[PDB]
Amino acid sequence: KLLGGGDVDHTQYAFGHTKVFFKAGLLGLLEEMRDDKLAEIITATQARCRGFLMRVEYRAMVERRESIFCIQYNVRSFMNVKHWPWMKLFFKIKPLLK
């Protein structure tokens, strides 16, 4: 599973019942070239992702836009009100209602 990642030559090695087999120094050379080739392949595939990743963040940030405000202002009210005679009154009284 580990070797899943890395911009490494997935050739140069080989697994078996008790251990992995690995090249150096040719196969070692191969891989290296390979390694660079994924940064390319990879580096480029990373980017879009990265890009894209934040692109979804904006869609969320934006949605959120108002729900906050609502929350924002809404609290403030209370902080002001909760100390107001009339509002306490309404409060004790709010229950007797139907």
Binding site: I42, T43, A44, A47, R48, M54, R55, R59
Partner: protein, 147 residues
């Protein structure tokens, strides 16, 4: 070129939080992506340093530097081929059907190469992966290229 797209300047006024018409160098990566460009973060990093520009110290910007950096990144959009994106994930899971097991794509997107946070990984899988734990990447890469 103008085609002079003056909406890039109007989007710079939506990303500058101070209203002085400057955008810090740390925002330039994400704003190139929001203008329709996907440069990798190492590429955005290199170019910066390449020009003896340090993203480690305070930065400001001017529109006169951000415009040519977006035009230097715009040539690299020929690297965005969807054949290689779907074939990458088709080599990532066995059998003839496009499904990644949930945690395979989440751990690979967070730890392999350019680190994506697990918060962003969950926001990119939310809706395309159901409770079977299998992400269909035919529709997943389609929706990722819809934005």
């Amino acid at each position: 070129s103008k085609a002079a797209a003056d909406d890039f300047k109007e989007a710079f006024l939506l990303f500058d939080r101070t209203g002085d018409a400057k955008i810090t160098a740390s925002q330039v990566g994400d704003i190139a992506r929001a203008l329709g460009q996907n440069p990798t973060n190492a590429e955005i990093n290199k170019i910066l340093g390449n020009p003896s520009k340090e993203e480690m110290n305070a930065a400001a910007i001017t529109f006169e530097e951000f415009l040519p950096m977006l035009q230097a990144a715009a040539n690299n959009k020929d690297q965005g081929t969807f054949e290689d994106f779907v074939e990458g994930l088709r080599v990532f899971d066995k059998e003839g059907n496009g499904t990644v097991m949930g945690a395979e794509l989440r751990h690979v997107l967070a730890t392999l190469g350019e680190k994506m946070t697990e918060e962003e990984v969950e926001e990119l899988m939310k809706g395309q992966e159901d409770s079977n734990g299998c992400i269909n990447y035919e529709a997943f890469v389609k929706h990722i290229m819809s934005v």
